[PDB]
Design a protein around this ligand. Structure first.
Ligand SMILES: [Cl-]
Ligand SMILES: [Cl-]
Ligand SMILES: [Cl-]
Lengths: 343, 338, 342, 339
């Protein structure tokens, strides 16, 4: 496979099944079933059609099963999944409430909302891991903290510090990242619902009521459509890379200390002690410091909708969040190997 | 010169002398003067030395202009300005208070504080012009926004919208970036005060007091030393690219509108293209301040210096873009069909 | 899945199973086996051990089946496939010939050489499609080259041009890229044979002779080891982004021509979105981001750097894949263009 | 100033006045003058107009000085220097021969040609220096390359290698870049001459011959216009970065041998140069992406793509100039390698 993150043997190191299944094709589809189920619900709520009309759709989709073979033909002809998906969803709905699934929505609405739902789940996992790592890193500090360390400034031997002083550089920003993450989790995971041209034209002055209700049913923030406004994505991608950068600084520190060898002991048995995990921390930092540029180039999205900037997001964002989760997984592993800090 | 922002003729497009003066040698020097004046006052307040010793530093460095040749030759000897700067700074203070300048401080303290101080002025200017352009664009939205527009999704003509619909996409994210900038400027501009190896080993228990009071006097946040913690710099740089990126979308919309040419009137759209340019510039440059997150040990020259090479041009590109978008808005005689 | 190239549905636009198969574990292992077979042959040729011992290493590996699950645990602990891979390869060899596999070689030697063998097969596929695309675009440029276009400069109408005039900007850079690819293929796909810390300390004075034999046997180039020297990788990745940039320039032109919609006729019934056209711009921008990672990994410190080296693992296959997809997508695009010009 | 390469104090570390001089406004205006001079001559020679007219243009421009203030104003008005420049250049020329200056040519023709003119001189200084450094690192190696080193693989102590071993990862990639720059310098620096939309439509049938002669006088390659074909720039940008990236590897190693401090010795008055090389390497590795994002230049001219090269490329060549200067300072400090 292309990415080490999913590779049959390289995921020995780079793996993260938990994060990666959020970006599985079944996970994506299931959120698009949840979008189309809630949209009918919200429209019945806001008097666009009746309730036994919405129930007809809701239990049609109940258990819907996608034909992955025809969906792939769907992105062949269309560039996009949703025409084919909707086409099958309608065939899954008895009567002529079938005509009314997807009403008022566009392909970007459902795709980006799906993305948002799963980014939300992904950030929860990341936060929990971040909290747990801060604690792990704190446990090291409370064990070895008063022990002396030789300072190193601009690649030279500096005056003596302590273990807790150097470890303040590992823990303190991770703590700030956890704060940034939880601030973002309030507003950031948003309903995408703009319709064909971003004006919700199939709903008139009922657009507001539908958007609010559909957002509530999906556990997502209500803000008006953001088809070309990719700031939120970019901002998110920045904290994903913020996390990898700090962890990479910690990895580089651990590797350096191992090469000098006098003030760290690593473990594995009860022996080569290659700081592979430490090195992999640097690699993941550098990867995400590259990928963040994709997400920023993708702020320039012309007109009402832009495939060129939107697809660059598809190419790159999932690997950024996976870089972040794997860096958390790898750092937690490196810390378990650190048996002594200090002289 | 290498950069079109500062270039003797290319500045007619890319210039922004107001944001650039903030990165001059003189504005850096003056901010470093404000660091050591105030550091002396903070330590006098703390009771480390006396009080006429601080008063000597404060007024000794009141008329201070530095020999730049020697400064350059000092970074040519050291890699870093401050050991020579401090030498001249010491020669202007009479008596034993000359010994006390820079006490407890390192080079990274004075360099990073100076930067934060000038970045804060930079961010105010930026915040103002951003607030202004929201009003300028909002004006065009209420002047012209009743008018029909051919909508365009994925490079094909779609259903009709109005000017007010498309204007929303330019305005709304800018009001988000004002909000993001105002959130950041509460305490994103920090004092750097760590000492040689980030432990303020010269101050003892008094480290706490001095650091709070030195931050107080400079209008900077009191966050514990962040020599190898550059998370906030990267966050700040992200904001800088957020604005350029939104204005780049706006430049792109105006360029496409000019090319089709039946739903805009402009008084050829050089300004619109430059918005796309500056957007992609900063979108590249954001990478540099993320590769500089990996700052090894207690001080990395490698990571730190990459910030000297990239950060000003991020801020200037945001400044300039804010200037250029305003010139573009003034060019717009009409949005919408006839 | 994570990349759209490999994704269960999105592959229907971003997919390229032919190029991607060259990055699958099965094809990677098969290159590694190939390296280890030829290594054994080359040492016994310079007479480091016996021939029917090397011949035991040949035929032992001929039926070899990897424990995929144990290979995984192998990089979990070691960080690299090879110590375990070699351990499974010794299980595949009967007799004291099993002591002689991977003699003189290091972990990076097998990995980098395995990549080089595979990059060679990708580049021959890329170069093949490139030449055919130039030929297809050349047929667009002959059908409609006489018809006039409105010139556009700096997002404004300029003077009249012809279709041939604007087609030259799609075709001429591709012909130059084809030439760049053929040139690179002569030396650029090297052997990696350095040993534990680059100097082939096991081999002694048989160093150069064995490396030459190993290079000839595997159809790669006889250069000294380049554990910490990644300039050829960077130079190749630049080529990958050069192709995508130009095809991006192509796809953007077609996208505008479709928006204005008077000087083009696109076909099928796929509305009528220029999806393939936009995709071309996307892939161009992708590789244009990625190329910087390959450049960040030029700084590989000391005798071997895990940090620099693993960054290449993360990013490089997606560069070759994007370039390969770009050629497919451009080919599909041009097959939808029925008329350029008024 | 915005960049440390030009900075009143920081250029004590990052300065290259000799590379930076090629990017000055004066040295640019000089190049563009040469373009219009050579254009008029090439047009007289291809019989587009008469000798007497071409000579009036030559002698007008021979004592021509530019109004910088009005040029500044001119790009504020037009987005580009040339219209004002050409307007100023017509005033230098007497008679109706003034109408002929700039004939057939467009703003990008004179701008990109000028870039190409100065980049060729950048690349000659860079090649020369690169050859000289290759020598210094070789003098360094054969002085000390019998002395053993502790090898280091993936940040752990490995077996014994010698000083010459490690130095091959320094010298052998720089020798390949010298060859790459040599190769590029043959037909890599190209005359840009296409006209309003790239079709040289003013020149009719004489286009090839005007262009060939225009290219010959300016010492640049004759090739068809590349107003939207920026792969020559991209390739040159790759070369720049390749150089700084190898020098970055060199610096990183030197700093690690400095930190360990047992298998090196530095005459100092430590490893600032060593870290600077790493800085310039990760800088160029950043910038290379802009030049690659600039490959997408739409239609017959794209201001947005084109002006990204304006922002980034002068600093890439300067970083490559400075990295070379900086490695040469560092190499002059190393008195011993090995135990
Ligand atoms: Cl220091
Ligand atoms: Cl901070
Ligand atoms: Cl190893």
């Amino acid at each position: 496979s292309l990415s080490p993150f999913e590779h049959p043997f390289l995921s020995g190191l780079f793996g993260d099944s938990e994060i990666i299944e959020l970006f599985s094709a079944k996970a994506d589809i299931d959120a698009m079933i949840r979008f189309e189920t809630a949209l009918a619900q919200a429209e019945a709520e806001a008097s666009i059609f009746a309730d036994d009309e919405a129930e007809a759709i809701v239990s049609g989709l109940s258990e819907f099963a996608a034909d992955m073979s025809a969906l792939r033909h769907g992105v062949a002809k269309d560039g996009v999944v949703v025409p084919e998906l909707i086409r099958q969803m309608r065939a899954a709905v008895a009567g002529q409430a079938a005509d009314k699934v997807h009403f008022g929505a566009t392909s970007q609405d459902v795709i980006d909302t799906s993305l948002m739902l799963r980014l939300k789940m992904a950030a929860e996992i990341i936060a929990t891991r971040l909290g747990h790592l801060i604690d792990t890193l704190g446990d090291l500090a409370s064990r070895d903290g008063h022990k002396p360390l030789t300072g190193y400034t601009r690649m030279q031997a500096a005056i003596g510090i302590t273990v807790a002083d150097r470890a303040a550089g590992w823990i303190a920003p991770l703590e700030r990242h956890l704060l940034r993450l939880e601030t973002f989790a309030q507003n950031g995971f948003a309903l995408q619902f703009g319709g064909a041209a971003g004006t919700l034209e199939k709903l008139g002055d009922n657009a507001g009521a539908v958007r609010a209700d559909l957002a509530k049913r999906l556990g997502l923030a209500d803000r008006p459509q953001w088809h070309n406004q990719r700031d939120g994505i970019a901002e998110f991608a920045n904290l994903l890379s913020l996390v990898t950068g700090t962890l990479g600084k910690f990895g580089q520190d651990i590797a350096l200390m191992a090469e000098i060898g006098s003030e760290i002991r690593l473990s594995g048995g009860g022996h080569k002690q290659n700081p592979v995990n430490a090195e992999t921390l640097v690699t993941l930092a550098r990867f995400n410091a590259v990928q963040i540029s994709a997400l920023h180039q993708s702020l320039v999205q012309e007109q009402e909708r832009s495939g060129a900037g939107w697809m660059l997001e598809w190419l790159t964002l999932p690997q950024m969040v996976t870089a972040t989760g794997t860096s958390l997984l790898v750092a937690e592993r490196l810390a378990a190997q650190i048996d002594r800090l200090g002289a």
